[PDB]
Amino acid sequence: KIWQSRRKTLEEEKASDWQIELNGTLFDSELQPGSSFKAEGFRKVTDKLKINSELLSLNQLNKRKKPVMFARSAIHNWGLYALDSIAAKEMIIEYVGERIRQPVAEMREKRYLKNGIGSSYLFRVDENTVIDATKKGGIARFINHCCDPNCTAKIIKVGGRRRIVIYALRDIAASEELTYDYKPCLCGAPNC
Amino acid sequence: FQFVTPVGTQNGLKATCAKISPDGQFLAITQGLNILIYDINRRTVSQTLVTSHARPFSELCWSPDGQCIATASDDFSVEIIHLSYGLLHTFIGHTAPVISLTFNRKGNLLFTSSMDESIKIWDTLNGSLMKTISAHSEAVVSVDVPMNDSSILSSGSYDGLIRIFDAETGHCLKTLTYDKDWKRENGVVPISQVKFSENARYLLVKSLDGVVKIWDCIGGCVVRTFQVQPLEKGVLHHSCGMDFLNPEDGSTPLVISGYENGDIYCWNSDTKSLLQLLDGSLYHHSSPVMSIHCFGNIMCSLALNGDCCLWRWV
Amino acid sequence: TRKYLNTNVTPHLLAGMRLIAVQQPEDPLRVLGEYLIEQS
Amino acid sequence: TRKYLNTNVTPHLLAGMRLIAVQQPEDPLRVLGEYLIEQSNI
Amino acid sequence: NILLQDPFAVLKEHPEKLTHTIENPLRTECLQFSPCGDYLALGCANGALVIYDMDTFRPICVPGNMLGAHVRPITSIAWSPDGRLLLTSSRDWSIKLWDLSKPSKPLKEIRFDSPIWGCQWLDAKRRLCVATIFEESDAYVIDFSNDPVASLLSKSVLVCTVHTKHPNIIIVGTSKGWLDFYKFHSLYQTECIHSLKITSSNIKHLIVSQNGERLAINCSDRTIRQYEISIDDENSAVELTLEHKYQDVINKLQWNCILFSNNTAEYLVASTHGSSAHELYIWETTSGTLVRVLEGAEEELIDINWDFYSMSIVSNGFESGNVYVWSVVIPPKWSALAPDFEEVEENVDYLEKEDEFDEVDEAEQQQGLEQEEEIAIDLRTREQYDVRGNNLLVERFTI
Amino acid sequence: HGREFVNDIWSRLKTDEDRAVVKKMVEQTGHIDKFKKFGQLDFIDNNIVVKTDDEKEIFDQIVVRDMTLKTLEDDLQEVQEISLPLFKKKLELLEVYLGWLDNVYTEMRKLDDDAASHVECGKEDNICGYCSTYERIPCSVEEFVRDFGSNEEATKIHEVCTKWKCNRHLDWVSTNQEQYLQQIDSLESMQERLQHLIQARKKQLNIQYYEEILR
Amino acid sequence: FDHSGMSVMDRSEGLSISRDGNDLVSVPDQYGWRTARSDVCIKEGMTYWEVEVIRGTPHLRFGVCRREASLEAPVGFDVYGYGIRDISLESIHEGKLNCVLENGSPLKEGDKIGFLLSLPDSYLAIFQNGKYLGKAFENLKLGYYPTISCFNGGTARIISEEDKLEYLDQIRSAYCVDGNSKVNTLDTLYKEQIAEDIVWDIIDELEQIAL
């Protein structure tokens, strides 16, 4: 059957030839072994071959408005990349949540661990008035949990006596993201 | 809502897409490196096959114009072929395998999907990229665009949370998560394909478990969930498909089921009733379904293990 | 010592005092100790 | 109240305190409460 | 109406804004949007009206298909409100009515004696197009759907014609009288009405509000005078009254182009150069207050336009040739990495309701669906409200 | 001999595979003698089966074009997918735009030469020679050198718009040709582009009946 | 340290100054709060510990609480607490939300309950306006402390004087064996427990010389 051959000898010289050359030579990354992606090969794997005072508080409400600029990173998921308006031992941004108490918000934390949503993403005074993150959070969830000693989220506050700022800092540079320890992590950052 | 039609797509490799292909006519189905065998929906006859490149084309998007067809391979590209012309414009992609496509109402610029969870946007007619909305970490498995809008951008992903995006380059418009991460493994991935309501004010998440909790981006609250009478029978998360079916806007809202490993259900708008499905697992079917699209009373279907099911109904 | 023997002397005293705590008389325990005799 | 001014109820309580602090608590109340009676008969 | 920016935030319409996105090289004279605000037209000194688009600021080419476009700059390209037709004008003696959905060969080229200053629709049909003449002192009304021919006004030097919201009343400049309004048609011959010689010399533009209220002017000796609009059988009585006249004359020099914003003239930008200010005033409609200015660039811009469904501003820099585009929103990134982080700025102790933490959930997840709301398909709100501004189709660059 | 061995290894490398690359090797090495390959073809119908038939054809195989097949298995090989009802219909209008309308526009460009020449000699005999009078090219005149003569100044015959050197019509007559010139430039540009589009259609239309032969 | 009053000594913030009248120690301050520490420790007796609704969202849940176990929260959170509800009277034991009550109780002062214990069948009651009288236990200083709850301005009232103005038939007529009724109820239990505190203080005074 010569008549179907002439397409097919072209097809063997076009389809298998010119595609995988244009595929493989213009593979900038290193030759990802992938399945046929409507056959449910998940391959959700860790190795990735893909590219990687009062008015002072009111001032911190407005001055360091966006000292970070949210972005994905190799560090945990969202390295917010702290850009500008940072210095050592200064209040970066008022941690703001929305929950009033330690006992029944511990009941709420028990309800969190049932769904496994947040073991972290609270901040506790533990006298009372543990402060939430996952209902009206400001920059609460975003601050990370690396083993980098960048930040201290502490309870220095005036007047209202419920303000939580990130007070004591060692000075960081642009795009290196704020890490407070919660009070050998799950970072995998190059200090672990 | 009851009929069947003649079927056929050479029954070769896996039936990855059966896009209903809105111009009324011109049904198309993959056969692997052979691509998009044309079937006029009235003539019901095999026609032009466009045959772009090597890897199995995952999904097909029907152009508003109907002149140009874009498929999504596994290797390096998302490939546009002009149905009458000679594939005069394919372009580089992200370095990951592409999975899904859909074009906007104007047909102006296109959306690619991503395995590296970083979807890109592409001006069609000039043929380049504008900026890239990388608001995920694990693969954005499905992306659709509603009919009467080019601003809502769907992110059906394997990060367990929908990320609605702006029109072109507005990063991260809103978000939406499903529930219940720890249950299957390491954070659940129910998200399979999110195809909009026609009026661009609702959205349908099909759980990979198989219960369609259909949402509202307006209130952020879910609307009623269509559930089969049997409990946990339809858990069909893995078996070689991510099955999905679109609404049918015949005269009422009509949700067809993307029901994997079983004959697909049909569901009312408001009541949670079963409709007009057969036990026809022998012909076309054996276990799964793969891709279902609907342009009217005509609604197509293709199954995976019964390769090239090639439907149209009523 | 007397600690244990007073916990061994206490219960009948608590019974009398729980009886007397009701109306709280001005002749309190002169009622009580005779009843504390009348056990054995 | 019965703390600061129930001293109609507690004059002989502090006395039987002294009584069992003096007498062995044997012959438990057949004499012990009776001494509080004899102190309370007045 | 505002149909989709509802899952953005609360309403952040915010009409005038201050940022640039810069477009492509060919310089033009005037610009215009689709009536659905979808994609943007402009016609260069080459005369090829390179039709662009709002989203993805890149040319889409429909011009010069089989019969070529005209070789001088256009003047007054104007969309049909249908969005299916197209009108051009020219320094090329001609109007070439186009239709994009068509064969792309001019539909009905007409020619004329002197260069046409400007042309617009009367917007009822294809059969209604009214234009201008450098020479004449008469209003040419040009039909297209019936015949490729033109008529007179049958009056007794004509610049700057326009319609109103009510399309059967036409506004006309600098006859014997320096301004007059000409009624219904001259095909179906209808009379003239009240004239008023407002200023000494010729005027530039006669923008009318989309709602049919405001009637601006660009006077020669620098007055911007707005007027309430007059109606059918309410002919003479309205627009005789000077409403709030602009231009605290001292700082600003001569005004180049004027047009109303979205509706009800609620902002009114206009262009002044010669003073080399390059900053444009978003004047208030009624009180006429100073509102903010735009930065622009230090190249002069010649003509401007707003749009209606995306609320941006574009103008062509007369020197640079690029088009300067305004109005970009900022993205609430607080809600970005979290699905439910409705972000509150200050600590509000939430009430923790009577059944909150009262007992564990006890498998109440999915016990009742209890639905009362629908998804149901669109049934044409505001009954008609729109003919959708559909795309040009074009297959090219196969090469 | 050694040629026989070359044929032998070039043959045995296939074993019923897509040996079109090896078919390219066939012509490339030892090109002068091809006699042995047919002598081995006398029995090597097993391993080569596609290229067994393809040994008879020409050495070029890789190109994507041709005339329609001379196989003649039936009437017109099913009439070449119905004789391109789509493409001949879409671009015989190209042949219209090629010959007829293009020749029309060149003739309309040619009319302005005489329309310029009458005005030229009239100007030499100043006044603005207007437009809009080359339409049927009347140039309505008897003896233009004297018909424009001093008696009537405002062109009563061969009437151009102008009174004098008048800028009312800012006459397009001078350099109007540019209109016609960029018009015929768009003609020739769409000519070349659309011929490239024809060749792209042929590049697609070979593949149609080449796939339909394989059904 | 404080002695006179009514169920005062250990409570939380919301039972503040507008409780001074009789019994209204409910909470308008913030909403989720603590049942006020009750007046007495029911060690082994039987009680007509009975409750009232004063002026009325006043849910104002009942409760039986214990020390060395949670008291900042309402009663259902507790280790082994027991309580009731206004909302259709949903019966709440510890760690569960079990069977609702048949009667109607949004009204004022019907749900007036009873108890019984032994020395080393334990019988709770509800007797909600004379009905739903039911018991379930495994026979569970440190007696039963029954205060009432919080949640946005309850109308808190309990009966502490001689009469039971509603459903006094617990005392010598019904709800229990009349000898095992134990009319040593909520207010006289103050007097007897305080006298016991007196005598155990006498014992502690002896322990000053037991050295």
From Swiss-Prot, chain C:
State its location(s): Nucleus
The record's region (DPY-30) falls at 1-40
Q: How does it assemble?
A: Component of the Set1C/COMPASS complex which consists of SET1(2), BRE2(2), SPP1(2), SDC1(1), SHG1(1), SWD1(1), SWD2(1), and SWD3(1). Interacts directly with BRE2.
State the family it belongs to.
Belongs to the dpy-30 family.
Q: What does this protein do?
A: Component of the Set1C/COMPASS complex that specifically mono-, di- and trimethylates histone H3 to form H3K4me1/2/3, which subsequently plays a role in telomere length maintenance and transcription elongation regulation. COMPASS recognizes ubiquitinated H2B on one face of the nucleosome which stimulates the methylation of H3 on the opposing face.
Q: What else is known?
A: Present with 937 molecules/cell in log phase SD medium.
What name goes with this protein?
Answer: COMPASS component SDC1
Please report the organism this UniProt entry assigns to the protein: Saccharomyces cerevisiae (strain ATCC 204508 / S288c) (Baker's yeast)
Swiss-Prot record, chain E:
One GO term of the biological process aspect? subtelomeric heterochromatin formation
Q: Tell whether Repeat is among the UniProt keywords.
A: yes
> Which of UniProt's keywords are assigned here?
Chromosome, Nucleus, Repeat, Telomere, WD repeat
SUPFAM superfamilies according to UniProt: WD40 repeat-like
Q: Which Gene3D superfamilies does the protein's record reference?
A: YVTN repeat-like/Quinoprotein amine dehydrogenase
Mutating K252A: effect? Answer: Decreases H3K4 di- and trimethylation
Compartments where found: Nucleus; Chromosome, Telomere
Outcome following mutation: I250A: Completely abolished H3K4 di- and trimethylation and greatly reduced H3K4 monomethylation
Phosphoprotein keyword on record: no
Quaternary structure per UniProt?
Answer: Component of the Set1C/COMPASS complex which consists of SET1(2), BRE2(2), SPP1(2), SDC1(1), SHG1(1), SWD1(1), SWD2(1), and SWD3(1).
Q: What role does it play?
A: Component of the Set1C/COMPASS complex that specifically mono-, di- and trimethylates histone H3 to form H3K4me1/2/3, which subsequently plays a role in telomere length maintenance and transcription elongation regulation. COMPASS recognizes ubiquitinated H2B on one face of the nucleosome which stimulates the methylation of H3 on the opposing face. SWD1/CPS50 acts as an assembly and regulatory hub for COMPASS complex formation. Serves as a highly utilized surface for COMPASS interaction with the nucleosome.
Note, other: Present with 907 molecules/cell in log phase SD medium.
User: What is this protein identified as?
Assistant: COMPASS component SWD1
Swiss-Prot record, chain F:
Misc:
Present with 1680 molecules/cell in log phase SD medium.
The Swiss-Prot or TrEMBL note on domains reads: The PHD finger is responsible for methylated H3K4 recognition. The C3H-type zinc finger is distinctly different from CCCH-type zinc fingers in both the amino acid sequence and the overall structure. Most CCCH motifs contain the C-X(7-9)-C-X(4-6)-C-X(3-4)-H sequence, while SPP11 employs the C-X(4)-C-X(10)-C-X(3)-H sequence to coordinate a zinc ion. The C3H-type zinc finger is necessary to ensure the overall structural stability.
Q: Which organism is it from?
A: Saccharomyces cerevisiae (strain ATCC 204508 / S288c) (Baker's yeast)
| GO terms of molecular function | chromatin binding; methylated histone binding; zinc ion binding
Subunit organization: Component of the Set1C/COMPASS complex which consists of SET1(2), BRE2(2), SPP1(2), SDC1(1), SHG1(1), SWD1(1), SWD2(1), and SWD3(1).
Identify this protein by name: COMPASS component SPP1
Presence of keyword Metal-binding: yes
**Keyword field:** Metal-binding, Nucleus, Phosphoprotein, Zinc, Zinc-finger
* Compartments where located: Nucleus
Which parts of the sequence bind Zn(2+) 3?
Answer: H1
Mention any one GO cellular component term assigned to this protein in its UniProt record. Answer: nucleus
Curated annotation (Swiss-Prot), chain G:
Q: How does inactivating the gene affect the organism? A: Leads to hypersensitivity to brefeldin A.
Superkingdom per UniProt: Eukaryota
Phosphoserine carried by residues: S105
Subcellular location, record wording = Nucleus; Chromosome, Telomere
Further remarks about this protein from its record: Present with 1310 molecules/cell in log phase SD medium.
Similarity comment text for this entry: Belongs to the cclA family.
Function statement: Component of the Set1C/COMPASS complex that specifically mono-, di- and trimethylates histone H3 to form H3K4me1/2/3, which subsequently plays a role in telomere length maintenance and transcription elongation regulation. COMPASS recognizes ubiquitinated H2B on one face of the nucleosome which stimulates the methylation of H3 on the opposing face.
What quaternary structure, including any partners, is listed in this protein's UniProt entry? Component of the Set1C/COMPASS complex which consists of SET1(2), BRE2(2), SPP1(2), SDC1(1), SHG1(1), SWD1(1), SWD2(1), and SWD3(1). Interacts directly with SDC1.
**The protein, known as:** COMPASS component BRE2
**Source organism of this protein record:** Saccharomyces cerevisiae (strain ATCC 204508 / S288c) (Baker's yeast)
